[PDB]
Design a protein around this ligand. Structure first.
Ligand code: LFI
Ligand code: ZN
Ligand code: ZN
Lengths: 595, 17
């Protein structure tokens, strides 16, 4: 039989990959933990080897056509190896694309912009331009950073992105995909499981339909923030118009986290930031992550491996070796789990420990599975697991139980609202940003937006869906999208919208399993084994089951739900409407500060 | 592509081969 002829190919595959994959994930770790011209080369060699293996492997797995397979697990594994890349394009084309990809990710990383009126020492996005966008209250300066980044990095990236859009589509169509867009939407595509199938288009619709129910809550926050922004930036905000893009707490307005200073409901109540308490308890990065360890043990998951503590880097290495410090978890296989994090005794970092040590628990649970089915159920399942961790490590009950918050300071309705806004500014703020951004690309790939009207339908859309207006007019020399990481780093972005729904869609269930009594915003599940089990029963599967069924194992649904998210922030949606009573709720795309 | 992930993050492509 071919089913068994195949079963034989996967077992030989599993054996040789696990070796070559470990060998490559180690070199990537080695490099990020010690940037050296040497570590680079190794990384490159290790990767060049893995790529060639997967190339041959895919070619071989085409020779086991799916219609003869009856078994599910084997077809998933075969679909994986069969689909994906396939270097369907010529060597000539399949190399330029790499160049474009690298060069695009190169200019962004090496991006340096100087003062258009005072250029002596140009500044880099991190940490200068970002520091200005996070901290400045000076309209003129925030505007200098914003435009400059898009006036230079985005323009030089414009010519490249167009080529990228072309070849990427060729590969997708040659990979049996309408456009490179339809491809990225395949991650959610479920075929073969009856009652749990999912199309590459059902997502766009769900995305849209799920995003409607959200419009009630986002407008009311848009209003509130609009109002507080007029207070801060005095002559620059129309009481009915969109919000200048450069006034949003970061460079793209991706998040509105850094506007709390300017939007707090009650500046009187002391902020939760327990960073000081930690500095007072003199917690060390080891304590922070070990404190994280105790959390999962309480819910019924295991301790970290020792090799985790032996191998992981939880502190800035030093000036002896340069190390990329993006908080990151790693799975190399052969039992090897590690985290790479330059921890800084802070409440954020503290919370980030719990996210990164959520992937490790996820990465572990599903290490019983075969190579190809050692992955999260979809591109959004991993992030959601990490977030639900933070959502309970911040519950004051947790902070008080932990001892970072004295048993005093009982929560008052004022403190709760401060929390739900702090939260909404970040979690809610990004869904429209995210939806808009992707949808722009979805269309760009669909060929629906000509280049001559790229940047037109860009802002046209930021004003319609997001409520954000360009502080300055941009022509077709500009590639503002490209001036965000995920764009010039060729990364599917919708994962953030889906994970946000799943995280609430998940917590409610585990909290219900934890038999939590009050609002979900104060559910610690810091000693709920029952809930740790329910999780482990989705975690342990990896990509073995389709995500629809995985979702059901825990929630009671086969498609993302918004109404759990709406219940979370609902005590702020009611207080937001009351505040926005005498205010205008909604925006006018026509308004422009530059008109 | 990508049939299995090492990091749970999207690091730069320059930090890859
Ligand atoms: C399977 C490839 C993979 O791990 N990813 C693709 N990617 C990169 O190109 C890294 C060099 C981003 N991903 C990361 O998790 C970064 C380590 C996912
Ligand atoms: Zn081989
Ligand atoms: Zn994460």
């Amino acid at each position: 039989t071919i089913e068994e002829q195949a079963k034989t190919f996967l077992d030989k595959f599993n054996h040789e990959a696990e070796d070559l994959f470990y060998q490559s994930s180690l070199a990537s770790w080695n490099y990020n933990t010690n940037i050296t011209e040497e570590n680079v080369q190794n990384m490159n060699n290790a990767g060049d080897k893995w790529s060639a293996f997967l190339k041959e492997q895919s070619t071989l797995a085409q020779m086991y056509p799916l219609q003869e397979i009856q078994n599910l697990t084997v077809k998933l594994q075969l679909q994986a190896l069969q689909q994906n890349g396939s270097s369907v394009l010529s060597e000539d084309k399949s190399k330029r694309l790499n160049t474009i990809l690298n060069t695009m990710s190169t200019i962004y990383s090496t991006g340096k912009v100087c003062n258009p009126d005072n250029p002596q020492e140009c500044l880099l996005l991190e940490p200068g331009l970002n520091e200005i966008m996070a901290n400045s209250l000076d309209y003129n300066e925030r505007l200098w950073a914003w435009e400059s980044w898009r006036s230079e990095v985005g323009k030089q990236l414009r010519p490249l992105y167009e080529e990228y859009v072309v070849l990427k589509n060729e590969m997708a169509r040659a990979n049996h995909y309408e456009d490179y867009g339809d491809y990225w939407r395949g991650d959610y595509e479920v075929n073969g499981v009856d009652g749990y199938d999912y199309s590459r288009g059902q997502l766009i619709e769900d995305v849209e339909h799920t995003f409607e129910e959200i419009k009630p809550l986002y407008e009311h926050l848009h209003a509130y923030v609009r109002a507080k922004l007029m207070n801060a930036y005095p002559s620059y905000i129309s009481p009915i118009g969109c919000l200048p893009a450069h006034l949003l707490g970061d460079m793209w307005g991706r998040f509105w986290t850094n506007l709390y200073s300017l939007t707090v409901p009650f500046g009187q109540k002391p902020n939760i930031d327990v960073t000081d308490a930690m500095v007072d308890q003199a917690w060390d990065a080891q304590r922070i992550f070990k404190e994280a360890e105790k959390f999962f043990v309480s819910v019924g998951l295991p301790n970290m491996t020792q090799g985790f503590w032996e191998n992981s880097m939880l502190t800035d290495p030093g000036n002896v070796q340069k190390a990329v410090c993006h908080p990151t978890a790693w799975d190399l296989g052969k039992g090897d789990f590690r985290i790479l994090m330059c921890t800084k005794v802070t409440m954020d970092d503290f919370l980030t420990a719990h996210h990164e040590m959520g992937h490790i628990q996820y990465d572990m649970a599903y290490a019983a599975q075969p190579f190809l089915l050692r992955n999260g159920a979809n591109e959004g399942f991993h992030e959601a697991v990490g977030e639900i961790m933070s959502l309970s490590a911040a519950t004051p009950k947790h902070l008080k139980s932990i001892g970072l918050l004295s048993p005093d300071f009982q929560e008052d309705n004022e403190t709760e609202i401060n929390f739900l806004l702090k939260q909404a500014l970040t979690i809610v703020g990004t869904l429209p940003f995210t939806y808009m951004l992707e949808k722009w690309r979805w269309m760009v790939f669909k060929g629906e937006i000509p280049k001559d009207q790229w940047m037109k339908k860009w802002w046209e859309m930021k004003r319609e869906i997001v409520g954000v207006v360009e502080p300055v007019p941009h022509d077709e020399t500009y590639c503002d999208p490209a001036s965000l990481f995920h764009v010039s780093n060729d990364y599917s972005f919708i994962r953030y919208y889906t994970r946000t729904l799943y995280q609430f869609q998940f917590q409610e269930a585990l909290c219900q399993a934890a038999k939590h009594e009050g609002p979900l915003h104060k559910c610690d599940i810091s000693n709920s084994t029952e809930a740790g089990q329910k999780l482990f029963n989705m975690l342990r599967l990896g990509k073995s089951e389709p995500w629809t069924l995985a979702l059901e194992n825990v929630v009671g649904a086969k498609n993302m739900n918004v109404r759990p998210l709406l219940n979370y922030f609902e005590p702020l949606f009611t207080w937001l409407k009351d505040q926005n009573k005498n205010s205008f709720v909604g925006w006018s795309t026509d308004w422009s500060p530059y008109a | 592509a990508c049939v299995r992930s090492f990091c749970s993050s999207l690091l730069p492509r320059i930090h890859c081969a």
